[PDB]
From a paper:
The ubiquitous and highly conserved molecular chaperones of the 70 kDa heat shock protein (Hsp70) family are key players in protein homeostasis not only during stressful, but also optimal growth conditions. All different functions of Hsp70s are achieved by a transient interaction of the chaperone with substrate proteins via its C-terminal substrate binding domain (SBD). This interaction is allosterically controlled by the nucleotide bound to the N-terminal nucleotide binding domain (NBD). ATP binding to the NBD increases association and dissociation rates by orders of magnitude, thereby decreasing the affinity for substrates by 10- to 400-fold.
Moreover, a crystal structure of the compound in complex with Hsc70 and the Bag-domain of the nucleotide exchange factor Bag-1 clearly shows its interaction with the ATP binding pocket. To elucidate how VER-155008 affects the conformation of human Hsp70 in the absence of a nucleotide exchange factor we solved the crystal structure of the NBD of human Hsp70 in complex with VER-155008 (data collection and the refinement statistics can be found in Table S3). As expected, the adenine moiety of VER-155008 was inserted into the adenine binding pocket between Arg272 and Arg342 forming hydrogen bonds between Oγ of Ser275 and N1 of the adenine ring. O2' of the ribose part of VER-155008 makes a direct hydrogen bonding contact to Nζ of Lys271. In addition, O3' of the ribose group forms another hydrogen bond to a water molecule, which is hydrogen-bonded to Oδ of Asp234. π-stacking between the side chain of Arg272, the dichlorobenzene and the 4-cyano-benzyloxymethyl moieties is similar to the one previously described. Nevertheless, the angle of the 4-cyano-benzyloxymethyl ring of the inhibitor and between the side chain of Tyr15 is about 50°, which is out of the range that is usually described as π-π stacking interaction. Overall the structure is similar to the previously solved structure of VER-155008 in complex with Hsc70 NBD and the nucleotide exchange factor Bag1. However, the central cleft between lobe I and II is not as large due to the fact that subdomain IIB is rotated by 5 – 6° towards subdomain IB as compared to the previous structure. The reason for this observation is most likely the absence of the nucleotide exchange factor Bag1, which is known to cause a 14° outward rotation of subdomain IIB. As compared to the ATP bound structures of the Hsc70 NBD subdomain IIB is rotated outward by some 8°, indicating that VER-155008 binding to Hsp70 does not allow the complete closure of the central cleft of the NBD. The crystal structure demonstrates that VER-155008 keeps the NBD in a conformation, which is about half way between the closed nucleotide bound state and the open conformation induced by the interaction with nucleotide exchange factors of the Bag-1 and Hsp110 families.
Residue numbers in the entry: 3 to 379
Write the structure that this text describes.
Amino acid sequence: KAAAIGIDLGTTYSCVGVFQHGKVEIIANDQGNRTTPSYVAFTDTERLIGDAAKNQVALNPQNTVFDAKRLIGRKFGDPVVQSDMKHWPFQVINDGDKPKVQVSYKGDTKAFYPEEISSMVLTKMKEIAEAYLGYPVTNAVITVPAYFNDSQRQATKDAGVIAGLNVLRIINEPTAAAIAYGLDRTGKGERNVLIFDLGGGTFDVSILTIDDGIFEVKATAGDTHLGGEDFDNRLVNHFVEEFKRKHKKDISQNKRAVRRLRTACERAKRTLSSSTQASLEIDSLFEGIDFYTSITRARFEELCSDLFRSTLEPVEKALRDAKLDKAQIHDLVLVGGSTRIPKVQKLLQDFFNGRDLNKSINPDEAVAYGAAVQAAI
Ligand SMILES: N#Cc1ccc(COC[C@H]2O[C@@H](n3c(NCc4ccc(Cl)c(Cl)c4)nc4c(N)ncnc43)[C@H](O)[C@@H]2O)cc1
């Protein structure tokens, strides 16, 4: 009988896995990537999902939808919805106090619900799983952040149903992360787990209790607008001033010059997780000038120091809400691609007095991993 899949439906990035033959397989897409962007684009002739939609973003900003997870199951008048709208190139209209994203598709003006947009991202993850398994997939477990209310969970389940799946259950992402490491398999007694999630655009800290495989959410804290993208912003803003100091020219009012500097900065930051120095080499960046420069891991840590240090406040709030002491936490799990930053790891380990972090499972894949495991139960 057909296998059930585990879907990690992320704000910026999505991942799908399957549990088969006592093993977990994180499924790669038609481009060989195990992570797909949570993007949907509407063109003159077609609808694009994932990387195909992400790669054409600058040539179609208004009809490339992303961040649907920020709107899913919320009301238009919601303050969250109202402040986020100011930063999106796509139009968000009001229908009965329900948000709808409005775009131009095949000559026509069309409006879709956030659950309709996420259903498109879920249709892609499903199809990725079917090409691998060689048969049509029906059953799925889709994850949600632990702080999500019942409207947001119903709306997420609705996306699965619209995508053609039978949503067996909706579980929490920190729950899926603990299941991946087998912390639910320790038996009778109380274990306290802290999951530290630092992704592309979101930051969540959760405290769970596991007693005989039964999970209890005790505290949730964080910042829905803190992630990897902010670290790129500090690097970008650092190299704009450096180009000024050297060439006496402002690159910020050229869209392509800023887009190209961003790409370079993302990769650099990435090199610095395993290296003490990274180099930036952009040909004809602005005014015909080649920008051949370098940054150290130390100068990078300096530019982001306030951001890395602020990740300890929601750790303190979560402990104080859960009414626990740091010595009371039995396990520490690292989830999210930004947790690869050595300074992020040093800060969390030092706070927890040199204790060991659970990080061997790819931080981008750990949530889908556990969700596939849970889907097989
Ligand atoms: N291909 C691919 C791909 C795979 C996973 C992701 C998810 O990324 C989410 C966040 O995770 C960040 N991140 C990632 N993401 C994993 C990744 C792996 C490969 C590629 Cl090409 C890319 Cl770019 C990203 N690696 C980091 C690192 N080594 N040091 C610091 N931050 C890292 C990334 O910059 C982003 O902010 C994004 C792209």
